[PDB]
């Protein structure tokens, strides 16, 4: 996998050249914003269970067919499996936030996922809705102004939304 710095290094290595000033400024900028990234990972991580649960209730209330007998979330073992998936996606998302790159998310988690759900009969569009529900829950939790030193964090939240959106587009 790669993190923000590693990706820039890999892009430069393939051209056999040293980093440019714009790349240095860009990596240095990420470092200066480091604390915010750590706060978002820490906040989303500490609330993981709440984000999944609330998103689950939201999804099923919006799509009652899934919990009807014979639907993909009926029975406790399938529901447990669905709640688990949501947690897996979230976990890998926090991974990409801490790294500042989506490689770990793509390589370990999104790659092939679409096919996996199609083979099981699990509706991908519905997984996307759950992923979108968690994005909004996670973002509101991470960008909450309470108990944190006031400052701009709008760039990070867009980056975080990107990862979730990117996860939803891999299964929609």
């Amino acid at each position: 996998m790669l993190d923000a710095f590693a990706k820039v290094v890999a892009q430069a290595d393939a051209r056999g050249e040293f980093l440019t000033n714009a790349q240095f400024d860009a990596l240095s900028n990420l470092v200066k914003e480091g604390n915010k990234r750590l706060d978002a990972v820490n906040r989303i991580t500490s609330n993981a269970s709440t984000i999944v649960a609330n998103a689950a209730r939201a999804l099923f209330a919006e799509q009652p067919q899934l919990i009807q007998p014979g639907g993909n979330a009926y029975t406790n073992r399938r529901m447990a499996a669905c709640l688990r998936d949501m947690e897996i996606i979230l976990r890998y998302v926090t991974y990409a936030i801490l790294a500042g790159d989506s490689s770990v998310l793509d390589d370990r988690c999104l790659n092939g996922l679409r096919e996996t759900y199609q083979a099981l009969g699990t509706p991908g569009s519905s997984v996307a809705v759950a992923i979108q529900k968690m994005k909004d829950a996670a973002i509101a939790i991470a960008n909450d102004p309470n108990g944190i030193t006031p400052g701009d964090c709008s760039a990070l939240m867009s980056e975080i939304a990107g990862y979730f959106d990117r996860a939803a587009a891999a299964v929609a």
């Binding site: 996998m1 790669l2 993190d3 710095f5 590693a6 820039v8 290094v9 890999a10 430069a12 290595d13 056999g16 050249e17 040293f18 980093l19 240095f24 990596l27 240095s28 470092v31 480091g34 604390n35 750590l38 990972v41 820490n42 991580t45 993981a48 976990r91 926090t94 991974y95 801490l98 790294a99 770990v104 370990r108």
Partner: protein
């Protein structure tokens, strides 16, 4: 690629768990060191040529036999010196990647892995490059942590060649 950040994630991923506080503390530590390491990489990058060209000669001056001894793996021919200068840049470029990525990962993946086989196969003397490195460790005019961090990857490169 190995970086303090990726190792942390690999550790939590192998246990199917979310990141821990200690791992988060490790990334913070990495960010704090990023400052001096980055300016080191910028400095080195700004004094490529003077370092590269200066490194080239520092090895012809200690291994003059490579100056005219017939053999494609030698700097006897101009292309031989071209190859050689090319390799020097490769080393310098790698150390800056390490400073940038906060670890040896870049240098391990792109240069260290297969190093011995490569030198054995093409008959290249590790000492040639080691002289290059000793010249850069004492030329980069870096001081404080910036110099501290650079020298770290420099020595590291020396080890692997020994």
């Amino acid at each position: 690629m190995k970086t303090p950040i990726t190792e942390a994630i690999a550790a939590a991923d192998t246990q199917g768990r979310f990141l821990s506080n200690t791992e988060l503390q490790a990334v913070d530590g990495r960010f704090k060191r990023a400052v001096a390491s980055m300016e080191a990489a910028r400095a080195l990058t700004n004094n490529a040529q003077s370092l590269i060209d200066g490194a080239a000669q520092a090895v012809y001056q200690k291994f003059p036999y490579t100056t005219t001894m017939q053999g494609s793996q030698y700097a006897s021919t101009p292309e031989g010196k071209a190859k050689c200068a090319r390799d020097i840049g490769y080393y310098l470029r790698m150390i800056t990647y390490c400073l940038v990525a906060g670890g040896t990962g870049p240098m391990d993946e792109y240069l260290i892995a297969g190093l011995s086989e490569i030198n054995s196969t093409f008959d290249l003397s590790p000492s040639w490059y080691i002289e290059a490195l000793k010249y850069i460790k004492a030329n980069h005019g870096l001081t404080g942590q910036a110099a501290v961090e650079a020298n770290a990857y420099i020595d590291y490169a020396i080890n692997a060649l020994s």
